[PDB]
Amino acid sequence: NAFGFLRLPMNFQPYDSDADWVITGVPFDMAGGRHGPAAIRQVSTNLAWEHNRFPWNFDMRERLNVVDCGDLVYAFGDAREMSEKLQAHAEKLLAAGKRMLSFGGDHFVTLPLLRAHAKHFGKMALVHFDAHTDTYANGCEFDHGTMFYTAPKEGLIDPNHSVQIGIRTEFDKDNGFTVLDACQVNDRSVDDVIAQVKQIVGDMPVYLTFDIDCLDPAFAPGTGTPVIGGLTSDRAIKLVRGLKDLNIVGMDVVEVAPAYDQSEITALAAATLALEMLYIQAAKK
Amino acid sequence: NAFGFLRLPMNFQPYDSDADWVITGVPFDAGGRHGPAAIRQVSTNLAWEHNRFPWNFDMRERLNVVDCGDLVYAFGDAREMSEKLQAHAEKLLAAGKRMLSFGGDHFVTLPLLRAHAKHFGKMALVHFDAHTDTYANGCEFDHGTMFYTAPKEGLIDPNHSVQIGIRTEFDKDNGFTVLDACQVNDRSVDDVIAQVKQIVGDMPVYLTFDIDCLDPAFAPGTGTPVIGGLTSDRAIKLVRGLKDLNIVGMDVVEVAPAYDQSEITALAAATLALEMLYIQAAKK
Amino acid sequence: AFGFLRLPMNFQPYDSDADWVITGVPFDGGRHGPAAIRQVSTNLAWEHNRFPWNFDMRERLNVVDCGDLVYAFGDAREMSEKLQAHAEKLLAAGKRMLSFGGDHFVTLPLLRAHAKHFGKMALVHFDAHTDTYANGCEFDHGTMFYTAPKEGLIDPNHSVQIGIRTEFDKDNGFTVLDACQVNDRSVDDVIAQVKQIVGDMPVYLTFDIDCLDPAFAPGTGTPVIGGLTSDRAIKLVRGLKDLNIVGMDVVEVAPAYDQSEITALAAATLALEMLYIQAAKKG
Amino acid sequence: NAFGFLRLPMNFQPYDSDADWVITGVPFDAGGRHGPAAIRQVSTNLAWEHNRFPWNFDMRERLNVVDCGDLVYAFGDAREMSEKLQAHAEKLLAAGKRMLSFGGDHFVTLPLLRAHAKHFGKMALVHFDAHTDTYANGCEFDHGTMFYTAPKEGLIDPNHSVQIGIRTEFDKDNGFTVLDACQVNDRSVDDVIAQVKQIVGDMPVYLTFDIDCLDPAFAPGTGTPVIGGLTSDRAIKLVRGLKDLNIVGMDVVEVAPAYDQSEITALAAATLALEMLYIQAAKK
Amino acid sequence: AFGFLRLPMNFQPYDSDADWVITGVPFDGGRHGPAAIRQVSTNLAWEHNRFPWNFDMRERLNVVDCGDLVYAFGDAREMSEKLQAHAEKLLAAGKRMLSFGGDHFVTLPLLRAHAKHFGKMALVHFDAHTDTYANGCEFDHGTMFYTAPKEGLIDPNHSVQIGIRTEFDKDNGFTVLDACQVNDRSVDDVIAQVKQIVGDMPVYLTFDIDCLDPAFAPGTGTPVIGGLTSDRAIKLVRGLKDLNIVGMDVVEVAPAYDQSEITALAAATLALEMLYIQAAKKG
Amino acid sequence: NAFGFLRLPMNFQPYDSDADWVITGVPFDMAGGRHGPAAIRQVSTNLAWEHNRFPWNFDMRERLNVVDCGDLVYAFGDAREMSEKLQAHAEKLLAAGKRMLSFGGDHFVTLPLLRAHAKHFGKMALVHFDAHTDTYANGCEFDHGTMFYTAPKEGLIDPNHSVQIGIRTEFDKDNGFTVLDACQVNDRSVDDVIAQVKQIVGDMPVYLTFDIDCLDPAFAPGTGTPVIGGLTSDRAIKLVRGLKDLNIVGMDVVEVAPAYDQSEITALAAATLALEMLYIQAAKK
Ligand SMILES: [Mn+2]
Ligand SMILES: [Mn+2]
Ligand SMILES: [Mn+2]
Ligand SMILES: [Mn+2]
Ligand SMILES: [Mn+2]
Ligand SMILES: [Mn+2]
Ligand SMILES: [Mn+2]
Ligand SMILES: [Mn+2]
Ligand SMILES: [Mn+2]
Ligand SMILES: [Mn+2]
Ligand SMILES: [Mn+2]
Ligand SMILES: [Mn+2]
């Protein structure tokens, strides 16, 4: 109570709660993204004092019952156990009617989530903010750059209605994934880019995943794999806000590595983005 | 002598000096006390330029600026800081001097507004910040309440005031014109300045600049950060675009050196401060 | 596997199958610039094709890193002389130079060696400063582009200075594209004007990292607010492909003032782009 | 559940729990608010040890410890923090629980002393700090005045109290025995502990630990640092040497994470905290 | 001039006039340990005779640095196998090893190679942890000195563990000199007991940097308060001269958590002492 | 006024003031010791609130008129001008009857000071706290490791009554300088070491110079040339305090490089040592 993200209530038995949205922390890397959820929670008090978060004219916590269920408990080193307890957690939540905002953690945390969400929402469109496309063909079982190769192959997402925003590194130009790379995103208007995004997604249900490395290192230095020429936090937030009218079933923010943060501005970016992900959900009501 | 901000002369008895502009540091409340120190130390970066770019003249040739050090007051006592600070300002103003002031908590502006209102009348406030600082029901010494109190005491006129760079909850119905960061970041400097001049009119202006207006990327060293702010480039051009307004006093506040990174925030504040001085000099 | 971008170290590069040689020049807190740049560059090494390129620079050029220049602990005079000798023998053997600072001063020896082998050059200069101070000490950064034209090394009248944010001289023949306008103009616009100024002349490309705004390059000794973004820096560099760049360096990185290695990463990324735009013209 | 300090259970309704010891965080005033957060985050470093060295048993097997989170109070209001904090403590104490408390400003101890005095009588204070915190003429909410006020309100008896690690000006004439850092650093642990036991007697003890007691080399993360302090090794052995005293409550305060370096200070505090728990457990 | 302590790099060290070879083993935030250690070591290089010694180690041993071990980005199994192969071929050619971590796990391959060439060894272990966990993952730091005795690589009964500050097993044959007593006893006292435990057996010297108190070595991934000072660490290492040390490593340095480079400097200084005490016995 | 070190009065015209002791800052390196005096001043407020600085039972500022004259103004790059304006400054102060506590800055700052002091006090005994002996035979004209070679050769100090405390690096064992190296200093009692110091110095006038690198890097990380195995701040302060009965004519603290400081603990060590240097002067009265 008054102890989680944004001073929301902790509830460690959330499956039968009245919550609409459950926040879950997943401290996991396989560096230093393990403390991402702690850092995000700790800095979110910056945001909590606004009754109506700018620029909105209503309070999210009045339109949505959001609870923080803490962090996922699993064997210290084991990633298989992480992955299985994460998908299990996610399935039990979805079956109870709840929706998920999730804090990472390694981006790999997303595969368990997509798997669980796919069972309840069908094949999904992926809106992916990152500097990496994370479609690596031959990597380790738990590599965090291989999950959006594995997800289409397991029929979890449809590349042909997915969009990858802020890319700045080598990628495969023929996946059916539409790559809106940081170069053009930075040189195009937010409206322009949202228009193109909406055209691709359709009315398909969306999973929204945001690796913080998508922001330029100056705006978000606290990440393990930085790439220069990224987005501003102002552009990120405007883009996220522009996704209001999509059918976003679930969402997560990942790769925040507090050990490389500077005066918390990377955790602040994640907490503000996570809150915007909530407000756009509340604004559809 | 050669020891204060920008290697300007220290003068701890400025009231009868032949200085036009007096720099005053006010170390007051986290940890924005070293704001003035940080600003002065980093300012030597700028001092070597004879004509600070992009100006084609030397501010120091057109204006006598002296740095009078920091305001002495009972260490924790805030009611002393205010009375000592207003008195300082009143005596400087009566002697014909003008003030560039370094914070320090943003609250320090309210004493300076009281002092300035007695000498210049009701003012227009040009307010760069991420917060509107109009909180109605707060502690008498809360930093985010100065622009609720000031209109109520008749110091400033909301209806010619403007609040630039806002990124947090505010009050749309109170007379202040709020140019939010979302907007300012998407609009040209000329567009915004035009609008600023429209609202302000011919009226006299007190310019207050809370560094949290700048995005934490450029001003990480602040106590209450908000993402999606202004760049240093935009902040400096906007400030430079107020040349033609009647700016009677000015301050830069909320630099918390504990959270600064490679002295970036203090550099921005000192640069902005210097630009505030050139605006004055380019009219003389 | 051990030098910049996991390239081969070759401490005997004068006779070698390499077409380009990377040389660290630790010199003054920019001693450690070259180390910082190498260490962070592994972030880029894993990309077969460095985005947004369509091929691997490593398959179009043999590039080797011969380490750092050895000179007397404090003697800058030996530093200069051993630096210019180093280049003269590299440039002599039909090998090019990407060099890492280090003090910006390091460019002046390199310009002396380059002028003997390519003639008077156009200077493409990324910096917040113009570095043209006449009445300055013998070994001093800032003064090089007063000395270099008087020694007939570069032609101011085809030289361009990009990102300037500080006091400078308007009447000396250098074209200054200050950070105020560079940030308000399109890259294409600026590149067009660069190409117009330089013409067909061989260019030396020098990049003082303070050109970037301190938010992006905090790790610098002489920082100035209101500079360029890394995005704009990289697009401008990339836009110089069609010019004839004979030599290039990246200087002023100071790790003691770096934050989460972002200055070093910006310099390593720019340096890699300087290599790609070379590889772009040979293939 | 598995979420609080040392991965212990959270329980936000601890008053009727079957817990022996309750951990409470009090975020209050620079920037010692994140003291509790910092302590909890770093504490996982210790949690993996089943028998925390050098003990030959597991504290968690002998004691039910729960973490009840942080004290909620009106954000800036300090008079609320005190009344809410004393009430919290009184209700826990009446229910038979004992308190390990994380600061937070050192001032938080005075409410906890009021609560404890009602349940345990007048106490002996064992006080590790670089400051004596006995300032007579201060603000009602000044951190360095709690051990002037507490004797005057009859909460503690100076004549069985001891102040360990002092490195700054103090008052020799007020009943407290002051073991200065110069002395403690030159004397064996057994020597000092002998003396501590002599002074304290059989009387009940409240153990308060301000982290600035540790030399800034080991606890850089503090707001008022003083050189020539204690090592973490000496601090932990001294604390461990109080096993036989009747310690009724305990706290660790003044961890300012903004000034911490690689989480060293928070680690020391959490380790010391855990040792405070083992002292209790080794008597049960 | 480019490796540790400005020693020569030699990427082909198997046939070389060197008697000792320095090898970085970047492995997991200890990837960057070896770099950090090399970069800071120049602080020591300028001393002809490293204090308090009466001669130059560099004039009694040929020491070279062959860089870092090349292995698959994430495959630790290849890391181990290429590491043990590396050592087996070095130890085979009559060359010794000072190695830099890197994860402490790196020692286990090195112990496998060393045991084949020197037999079962006494372990002199500086760490806050005993690293004897039985029921742990295949590749995991902490478990090595459970695996190493079961594989007959070391003899617990002549092995000593110095600086322990955490849970451990009292009954397994290892002699634990915990940081509580080590800090309360004289170096001579402790060295005497070390010499008594080890006897005439060949020793492998492994130094996990968390042994030092976090105040002295902040840059570590698993820190524990109440550890050793660098002064005491260096005096203890120095006191092992008369023992027969066949191989040595320094591990767990994590720069992401270092403060003003003091952890790296402590490790580079210890490593240099490990070299002097070798040079002490040959001259 | 109330603006210098320890909130003491600034006085930029100190030669004819009533001060006994003048504090002078010398921002100079030839890295990053230039801001040493600023850092020292800024952190000294930590100390200023104690009326009687522990462990003393009197107030220094009651027994001594101490003023801070600011920093020495000279040509930005030129060290010759630094050196000459520094010695000139020092001579004018000494001739006026004033005594000097000086903040560095590069250790080289000491040569101008010794030169000026020698003219007024004669040949001096040097009490030197540092990890380096600074007796380098062949270095640059302004090398900061060569000044205590140059000073005996110019007849400024007598090595045979000088003592070098906390040494941890290669030095020349036959200078007549008595080296009390950190190894033994750390293993010997403070009384023991002071006794030996007093025996060597005699009643000769002492210049006390303290390079902060003498402290172990953990206690004082903010220096350019660190060496491990140094002294604690507690031992440094006790030793300095033990020099009360020597005839210390002048004093300085040098090499504080704020760019490598951690939470100001290096500047705090210098400011506390500098204050102790003042209290021992006041305690003889
Ligand atoms: Mn990414
Ligand atoms: Mn990703
Ligand atoms: Mn604000
Ligand atoms: Mn404000
Ligand atoms: Mn520059
Ligand atoms: Mn330059
Ligand atoms: Mn205290
Ligand atoms: Mn206290
Ligand atoms: Mn360990
Ligand atoms: Mn270990
Ligand atoms: Mn030294
Ligand atoms: Mn020295």
Author numbering:
A (entry chain C), F (entry chain C): 15 to 44, 50 to 304
B (entry chain A), D (entry chain A): 15 to 43, 50 to 304
C (entry chain B), E (entry chain B): 16 to 43, 51 to 305
Paper text:
Agmatinase (AGM) is the enzyme that catalyzes the hydrolysis of agmatine in urea and putrescine, and to date, E. coli AGM (EcAGM) is the best agmatinase kinetically characterized. AGMs belong to the ureohydrolases enzymes family, containing all the conserved residues of this family similar to arginases (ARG), proclavaminic acid amidino hydrolases (PAH), guanidinopropionase (GpuA), and guanidinobutyrase (GbuA).
To obtain the structure of EcAGM, we carried out crystallization tests in the presence of guanidine (Gnd) chloride 100 mM, obtaining crystals in two different conditions. Two structures in different space groups were solved by X-ray crystallography, one at low resolution (3.2 Å), including a guanidine group; and other at high resolution (1.8 Å) which presents urea and agmatine in the active site. These structures made it possible to understand the interface interactions between subunits that allow the hexameric state and postulate a catalytic mechanism according to the Mn2+ and urea/guanidine binding site. The solved structures in complex with guanidine and urea provide insights into the catalytic mechanism of the EcAGM. In prior studies, Asp153 has been proposed as a critical residue to form an H-bond with w1 and guanidine moiety, suggesting a critical role in the orientation and stabilization of the w1, allowing an optimal attack on the guanidinium carbon. The structures with guanidine and urea made it possible to propose EcAGM’s catalytic mechanism and provide evidence of the importance of His163 as a proton shuttle and a stabilizer of the transition state in bacterial ureohydrolase.
